[PDB]
Every structure is written in C-alpha cells, then in structure tokens.
C-alpha cells in the first residue's frame, strides 16, 4: 500500500506464442497480422509494446545474467509492464524471447498466453517452405505437447485470420468487462 | 483436402 | 455498537469508485465462513488458488477491500495475509 498473494500487473499482459519461433517469417508475420488487428479493434483501450529484454529471467552471491540481457534491465522492463497496466488499459507484449508459456511461469507477470496453433505439422512445413526448418518444427511440437487448459488462456486454431481475430477479440472484450465493472466510476 | 484448405488459409493470413 | 458495521459498509461503498492500488494472484484458497468475523456479514470475497483480485485499500489488520477479477463480482472484504495465517493456525491447533 508460503506468501498467500503474489503482486501481479493490474491487467494481465497478453503474450502471443506460436505457431513456431519468433524471429522467423511464418511466426512473425502471423503474429503481426494479429497485433495489427488488436491495434485497431481495441483503439484507445490498448497498449502494444515491444519487449526485447529477456523477461524469462524475471523472478550470498549476486544473481546475474549470462546473456546480453541483464537482471537489472529485465527488472526495469517488468516495472515498465506493471506501470503500463496501472490504469487498466489492455496490455499486449510483443515479447521477442518468449516462445513457450513455461518461460513466464515463474515470473510475477501472470500473462494471458495466446497460443496461435497450426494443428498440422505438415501444414507448418509447407508454410515455411513457401517463404532453419527443424528448429521451427521442434518449437511448434513443444507447444502442441503443453497441457492446453493450464498452459494457455486462448488457443487460436482457426485457419482464417478473420476467425482467429474475432475469437481473440471476444476473449479480450470479456476480460475488459471482468476488469472494468460499471460500478468502478511485428509492431 | 482439409490440410489444403488449412494451407490456403494461412497463406492468406501471412499475405495480410 | 453495530454502527461499526455501518462504517464498514460505508467504507466499502466509498471504495467502489477508488482506483485499483494493486492486483494479486492467490496461492491459496479461502472459503469464507460466518465465524471468520467479516466486518460486514456476507461481504467476504472467497477465492480459489490462482484467482486474481483487484485491491483498493486496507480496512484493518485482518481485511483488505477489493474484488475478484470476474464479471459480476463486486467489492467486498479480502482476508489480509495475517488473517489467512491466523485462520490456518487456528485450524491446525483445533485439528491436533
Ligand atoms: Cl557476488
């Protein structure tokens, strides 16, 4: 103003994972079309922000990072995310280094994980060739092995962008209502 | 054929 | 008297329009009972582990005011960490 309560952002930040790995064109373009849609569908109610720092590292020797992303920079980015959610705008992270929900499981971010799922590995393969194949297939396969109810908040398995967008919007409109009762008053 | 409609869907998504 | 209850209900109403101070995700469940001595009867917020709460302010050492992040749920009293701990201790003692 053992602990029973963990402090989390006032609006759970939306993080997209799948169909495959970020940094490659199939995943990057498929997620971008979704971010583009959110930007206009939730205009005035959403903040979409790039996170390049490796927020997977968020949680008597001093703890340090062995990559270019420091624990101080990560902490700065965690505080920026909490602060962006403080007035209850929807928050969406374009988080470069998160390709799997287990990478945020131990943070205090409590994300809404949106799984952009290609149901068939054969469809994913052909997609990639239509444009480093094996790292992409393994990442998609890892996603497909997660227990869906506990790992993901939304699964977009629709093959039409229009239908994936409306399903995600429906979810985010309901979250909006849950967080804004009338009684309270790639990118 | 379901896989073929899948692929066309995702190709159109990527194009968008 | 029992205008203590009046002041507690009045603090609840005043909170409805206040900002969210912070949010918490729960790591334990709380299933409210009348014997928990809630400042206004029937206004305790129960929850399960991994639920989300929006917190407005602190009423006293045993109770916060806030709500479950769920459509149709409204402001009420949320047990403080100390209150959760004292319920667990009182239960452990009673069970020995
Ligand atoms: Cl050290």
Short mmCIF file of C-alpha atoms and ligand atoms in Angstrom, two decimals:
data_model
loop_
_atom_site.label_atom_id
_atom_site.label_comp_id
_atom_site.label_asym_id
_atom_site.label_seq_id
_atom_site.Cartn_x
_atom_site.Cartn_y
_atom_site.Cartn_z
CA UNK A 1 0.00 0.00 0.00
CA UNK A 2 4.38 -19.54 1.72
CA UNK A 3 3.03 -15.98 0.91
CA UNK A 4 -0.70 -16.29 0.05
CA UNK A 5 -0.66 -13.45 -2.57
CA UNK A 6 1.76 -12.55 -5.34
CA UNK A 7 1.57 -8.99 -6.70
CA UNK A 8 0.89 -9.10 -10.47
CA UNK A 9 0.04 -6.42 -13.05
CA UNK A 10 -3.45 -4.99 -12.69
CA UNK A 11 -4.09 -6.09 -16.29
CA UNK A 12 -2.55 -9.40 -17.21
CA UNK A 13 -0.22 -8.73 -20.13
CA UNK A 14 -1.11 -10.60 -23.36
CA UNK A 15 1.71 -12.61 -24.81
CA UNK A 16 1.49 -14.47 -28.14
CA UNK A 17 3.28 -17.80 -28.65
CA UNK A 18 3.27 -19.94 -31.79
CA UNK A 19 2.77 -21.21 -34.34
CA UNK A 20 6.51 -21.62 -34.26
CA UNK A 21 9.59 -19.49 -33.29
CA UNK A 22 9.71 -15.71 -33.23
CA UNK A 23 12.33 -14.04 -35.44
CA UNK A 24 11.33 -16.20 -38.47
CA UNK A 25 8.85 -15.12 -41.10
CA UNK A 26 5.92 -17.58 -40.56
CA UNK A 27 5.52 -16.79 -36.86
CA UNK A 28 6.48 -13.16 -37.25
CA UNK A 29 4.02 -12.43 -39.99
CA UNK A 30 1.18 -14.47 -38.44
CA UNK A 31 1.56 -12.67 -35.06
CA UNK A 32 1.96 -9.30 -36.78
CA UNK A 33 -1.42 -9.67 -38.51
CA UNK A 34 -2.91 -10.31 -35.03
CA UNK A 35 -1.15 -7.30 -33.45
CA UNK A 36 -2.28 -5.13 -36.39
CA UNK A 37 -5.85 -6.22 -35.78
CA UNK A 38 -5.71 -5.63 -31.99
CA UNK A 39 -4.28 -2.14 -32.60
CA UNK A 40 -7.38 -1.09 -34.48
CA UNK A 41 -10.07 -3.20 -32.80
CA UNK A 42 -9.06 -2.03 -29.28
CA UNK A 43 -8.12 1.54 -30.29
CA UNK A 44 -7.94 3.81 -27.25
CA UNK A 45 -8.08 0.85 -24.83
CA UNK A 46 -4.83 -1.00 -25.64
CA UNK A 47 -1.06 -0.52 -25.27
CA UNK A 48 1.05 -2.78 -27.53
CA UNK A 49 4.67 -2.70 -26.61
CA UNK A 50 7.82 -4.32 -27.80
CA UNK A 51 9.82 -6.20 -25.15
CA UNK A 52 13.31 -7.13 -26.43
CA UNK A 53 14.74 -7.89 -22.93
CA UNK A 54 14.57 -11.48 -21.82
CA UNK A 55 11.72 -11.38 -19.34
CA UNK A 56 12.04 -15.15 -18.95
CA UNK A 57 14.85 -14.26 -16.49
CA UNK A 58 12.42 -12.40 -14.17
CA UNK A 59 11.67 -13.88 -10.69
CA UNK A 60 25.49 -14.58 -0.63
CA UNK A 61 26.25 -14.20 -4.41
CA UNK A 62 24.61 -11.53 -6.60
CA UNK A 63 22.36 -13.03 -9.25
CA UNK A 64 23.49 -12.05 -12.78
CA UNK A 65 22.66 -12.99 -16.37
CA UNK A 66 24.91 -14.85 -18.78
CA UNK A 67 23.31 -13.30 -21.86
CA UNK A 68 23.25 -9.71 -23.07
CA UNK A 69 20.00 -9.14 -21.19
CA UNK A 70 20.90 -8.13 -17.60
CA UNK A 71 18.76 -8.79 -14.49
CA UNK A 72 18.65 -5.04 -13.93
CA UNK A 73 17.36 -4.40 -17.49
CA UNK A 74 14.83 -7.24 -17.05
CA UNK A 75 13.65 -5.75 -13.75
CA UNK A 76 13.33 -2.34 -15.39
CA UNK A 77 11.16 -3.91 -18.10
CA UNK A 78 8.99 -5.75 -15.52
CA UNK A 79 8.35 -2.42 -13.74
CA UNK A 80 7.51 -0.76 -17.10
CA UNK A 81 4.92 -3.51 -17.79
CA UNK A 82 3.24 -3.17 -14.32
CA UNK A 83 3.11 0.61 -14.77
CA UNK A 84 1.60 0.34 -18.28
CA UNK A 85 -1.26 -1.76 -16.81
CA UNK A 86 -1.84 0.51 -13.74
CA UNK A 87 -4.81 2.45 -15.18
CA UNK A 88 -6.42 -0.75 -16.58
CA UNK A 89 -5.74 -0.30 -20.29
CA UNK A 90 -5.28 -3.69 -22.08
CA UNK A 91 -1.58 -4.52 -22.26
CA UNK A 92 -0.05 -6.66 -25.08
CA UNK A 93 3.61 -7.58 -25.17
CA UNK A 94 5.43 -8.32 -28.39
CA UNK A 95 7.94 -10.21 -26.33
CA UNK A 96 10.82 -11.41 -28.57
CA UNK A 97 12.25 -14.15 -26.37
CA UNK A 98 9.00 -15.90 -25.23
CA UNK A 99 8.10 -18.85 -27.43
CA UNK A 100 6.69 -21.09 -24.69
CA UNK A 101 4.40 -20.44 -21.66
CA UNK A 102 6.81 -22.21 -19.27
CA UNK A 103 9.28 -19.32 -19.81
CA UNK A 104 6.87 -16.90 -17.94
CA UNK A 105 5.51 -19.42 -15.38
CA UNK A 106 7.96 -18.31 -12.67
CA UNK A 107 7.60 -14.59 -13.16
CA UNK A 108 5.15 -12.25 -11.47
CA UNK A 109 3.75 -11.23 -14.87
CA UNK A 110 0.81 -13.63 -14.85
CA UNK A 111 0.38 -13.31 -18.62
CA UNK A 112 -2.62 -14.11 -20.75
CA UNK A 113 -0.96 -16.65 -23.10
CA UNK A 114 -2.38 -16.66 -26.62
CA UNK A 115 -1.41 -19.80 -28.49
CA UNK A 116 -1.51 -19.29 -32.24
CA UNK A 117 -1.72 -23.00 -33.15
CA UNK A 118 -1.23 -24.68 -36.53
CA UNK A 119 -2.91 -28.01 -36.00
CA UNK A 120 -0.92 -29.98 -38.65
CA UNK A 121 2.94 -30.12 -38.73
CA UNK A 122 2.65 -30.84 -42.47
CA UNK A 123 0.84 -27.50 -42.95
CA UNK A 124 3.53 -25.72 -40.90
CA UNK A 125 6.32 -27.32 -43.01
CA UNK A 126 4.72 -26.27 -46.31
CA UNK A 127 4.19 -22.73 -44.91
CA UNK A 128 7.86 -22.38 -44.03
CA UNK A 129 8.94 -23.72 -47.48
CA UNK A 130 6.53 -21.23 -49.20
CA UNK A 131 8.77 -18.46 -47.91
CA UNK A 132 16.24 -23.39 -40.36
CA UNK A 133 13.22 -25.71 -40.76
CA UNK A 134 13.96 -28.14 -37.93
CA UNK A 135 14.22 -25.63 -35.03
CA UNK A 136 10.85 -24.24 -36.21
CA UNK A 137 9.15 -27.76 -36.21
CA UNK A 138 10.53 -28.65 -32.76
CA UNK A 139 9.29 -25.34 -31.23
CA UNK A 140 5.76 -25.96 -32.70
CA UNK A 141 5.82 -29.50 -31.48
CA UNK A 142 6.79 -28.40 -27.97
CA UNK A 143 3.80 -26.05 -27.92
CA UNK A 144 1.49 -28.88 -29.07
CA UNK A 145 2.67 -31.01 -26.11
CA UNK A 146 1.61 -28.48 -23.43
CA UNK A 147 -1.46 -29.37 -21.38
CA UNK A 148 -3.77 -26.81 -23.06
CA UNK A 149 -6.07 -25.95 -20.09
CA UNK A 150 -3.28 -24.98 -17.69
CA UNK A 151 -0.72 -23.61 -20.24
CA UNK A 152 -2.84 -21.35 -22.44
CA UNK A 153 -5.59 -18.81 -21.84
CA UNK A 154 -6.65 -18.67 -25.51
CA UNK A 155 -6.00 -21.06 -28.38
CA UNK A 156 -6.40 -19.75 -31.92
CA UNK A 157 -6.56 -22.86 -34.08
CA UNK A 158 -8.68 -21.29 -36.80
CA UNK A 159 -7.10 -21.31 -40.27
CA UNK A 160 -8.67 -17.98 -41.32
CA UNK A 161 -7.15 -14.78 -39.92
CA UNK A 162 -10.61 -13.20 -39.67
CA UNK A 163 -11.89 -16.05 -37.44
CA UNK A 164 -8.71 -16.13 -35.22
CA UNK A 165 -9.06 -12.34 -34.74
CA UNK A 166 -12.73 -12.42 -33.75
CA UNK A 167 -12.10 -15.33 -31.32
CA UNK A 168 -9.22 -13.34 -29.64
CA UNK A 169 -11.33 -10.12 -29.56
CA UNK A 170 -14.24 -11.94 -27.93
CA UNK A 171 -11.82 -13.17 -25.24
CA UNK A 172 -10.30 -9.71 -24.72
CA UNK A 173 -13.74 -7.97 -24.60
CA UNK A 174 -14.76 -10.36 -21.85
CA UNK A 175 -11.51 -9.71 -19.93
CA UNK A 176 -12.20 -5.99 -20.32
CA UNK A 177 -15.62 -6.41 -18.71
CA UNK A 178 -14.15 -8.52 -15.90
CA UNK A 179 -11.62 -5.75 -15.14
CA UNK A 180 -13.94 -2.72 -15.69
CA UNK A 181 -17.24 -3.24 -13.87
CA UNK A 182 -19.69 -0.25 -14.35
CA UNK A 183 -19.53 0.35 -10.53
CA UNK A 184 -15.82 1.46 -10.76
CA UNK A 185 -16.82 5.03 -11.94
CA UNK A 186 5.68 -7.37 -35.76
CA UNK A 187 4.91 -3.89 -34.30
CA UNK B 1 -8.14 -31.72 -48.58
CA UNK B 2 -8.57 -30.30 -45.06
CA UNK B 3 -4.81 -29.75 -44.94
CA UNK B 4 -5.06 -27.99 -48.30
CA UNK B 5 -7.70 -25.58 -47.06
CA UNK B 6 -5.54 -25.02 -43.90
CA UNK B 7 -2.51 -24.01 -46.04
CA UNK B 8 -4.55 -21.63 -48.22
CA UNK B 9 -5.96 -20.06 -45.04
CA UNK B 10 -2.53 -19.48 -43.52
CA UNK B 11 -1.02 -18.27 -46.82
CA UNK B 12 -3.83 -15.65 -47.00
CA UNK B 13 -3.15 -14.72 -43.27
CA UNK B 14 0.59 -14.20 -43.92
CA UNK B 15 -0.22 -12.10 -47.05
CA UNK B 16 -2.46 -9.94 -44.83
CA UNK C 1 -22.34 -0.71 18.92
CA UNK C 2 -23.23 -2.04 15.40
CA UNK C 3 -22.71 1.16 13.61
CA UNK C 4 -19.21 -0.40 13.31
CA UNK C 5 -20.97 -2.42 10.58
CA UNK C 6 -22.40 0.84 9.20
CA UNK C 7 -18.95 2.47 8.91
CA UNK C 8 -17.55 -0.72 7.34
CA UNK C 9 -20.36 -0.81 4.72
CA UNK C 10 -19.81 2.93 4.11
CA UNK C 11 -16.03 2.36 3.58
CA UNK C 12 -16.94 -0.42 1.03
CA UNK C 13 -19.23 1.96 -0.94
CA UNK C 14 -16.54 4.71 -0.95
CA UNK C 15 -14.00 2.18 -2.31
CA UNK C 16 -16.13 1.27 -5.35
CA UNK C 17 -15.01 4.38 -7.19
CA UNK C 18 -11.36 4.44 -5.94
CA UNK C 19 -8.51 3.24 -8.15
CA UNK C 20 -7.01 -0.26 -8.12
CA UNK C 21 -3.97 0.06 -5.89
CA UNK C 22 -2.53 -3.34 -6.94
CA UNK C 23 -3.55 -6.81 -8.13
CA UNK C 24 -2.70 -10.16 -6.66
CA UNK C 25 -2.77 -13.73 -7.80
CA UNK C 26 -3.62 -16.09 -4.98
CA UNK C 27 -1.54 -19.12 -3.98
CA UNK C 28 -4.17 -20.49 -1.51
CA UNK C 29 -7.96 -20.83 -1.33
CA UNK C 30 -10.26 -19.00 1.13
CA UNK C 31 -13.77 -20.37 1.65
CA UNK C 32 -15.50 -17.76 3.83
CA UNK C 33 -17.44 -18.75 6.92
CA UNK C 34 -19.60 -16.67 9.25
CA UNK C 35 -17.18 -17.43 12.15
CA UNK C 36 -14.37 -15.57 10.31
CA UNK C 37 -15.98 -12.35 11.72
CA UNK C 38 -16.15 -10.32 8.47
CA UNK C 39 -16.65 -6.52 9.08
CA UNK C 40 -19.96 -6.73 7.19
CA UNK C 41 -21.70 -10.14 7.18
CA UNK C 42 -21.92 -11.73 3.77
CA UNK C 43 -19.38 -9.33 2.20
CA UNK C 44 -16.27 -11.56 2.37
CA UNK C 45 -14.69 -12.43 -1.04
CA UNK C 46 -13.93 -16.16 -1.32
CA UNK C 47 -11.44 -17.42 -3.86
CA UNK C 48 -9.57 -20.49 -5.11
CA UNK C 49 -5.83 -20.77 -5.68
CA UNK C 50 -4.67 -18.92 -8.81
CA UNK C 51 -7.56 -16.45 -8.83
CA UNK C 52 -6.98 -12.79 -9.43
CA UNK C 53 -8.01 -9.98 -7.12
CA UNK C 54 -8.10 -6.23 -7.57
CA UNK C 55 -7.24 -4.49 -4.34
CA UNK C 56 -8.42 -0.97 -3.39
CA UNK C 57 -7.20 -0.35 0.18
CA UNK C 58 -6.63 -1.75 3.67
CA UNK C 59 -9.59 -1.73 6.10
CA UNK C 60 -7.69 -3.07 9.12
CA UNK C 61 -5.07 -5.66 10.11
CA UNK C 62 -7.40 -8.57 9.12
CA UNK C 63 -9.08 -7.22 5.93
CA UNK C 64 -8.45 -5.53 2.65
CA UNK C 65 -11.16 -4.21 0.30
CA UNK C 66 -11.23 -5.35 -3.30
CA UNK C 67 -12.87 -7.70 -5.76
CA UNK C 68 -12.39 -10.89 -7.77
CA UNK C 69 -11.49 -10.16 -11.38
CA UNK C 70 -14.65 -11.81 -12.69
CA UNK C 71 -17.74 -10.32 -14.43
CA UNK C 72 -20.49 -9.59 -11.93
CA UNK C 73 -18.24 -9.82 -8.90
CA UNK C 74 -18.28 -6.76 -6.68
CA UNK C 75 -16.26 -5.10 -3.98
CA UNK C 76 -16.03 -6.86 -0.60
CA UNK C 77 -13.53 -7.74 2.16
CA UNK C 78 -10.49 -9.87 1.28
CA UNK C 79 -8.61 -11.53 4.15
CA UNK C 80 -5.22 -10.00 4.81
CA UNK C 81 -2.10 -12.22 4.74
CA UNK C 82 -2.17 -12.10 8.59
CA UNK C 83 -5.83 -13.17 8.63
CA UNK C 84 -5.10 -16.08 6.26
CA UNK C 85 -2.21 -17.12 8.55
CA UNK C 86 -4.30 -16.91 11.73
CA UNK C 87 -7.08 -18.99 10.16
CA UNK C 88 -4.55 -21.65 9.14
CA UNK C 89 -3.02 -21.63 12.68
CA UNK C 90 -6.39 -21.83 14.44
CA UNK C 91 -7.35 -24.75 12.15
CA UNK C 92 -4.01 -26.60 12.79
CA UNK C 93 -4.42 -26.20 16.56
CA UNK C 94 -8.05 -27.31 16.55
CA UNK C 95 -7.12 -30.39 14.43
CA UNK C 96 -4.37 -31.61 16.87
CL1 LIG D 1 28.78 -11.56 -5.93
#
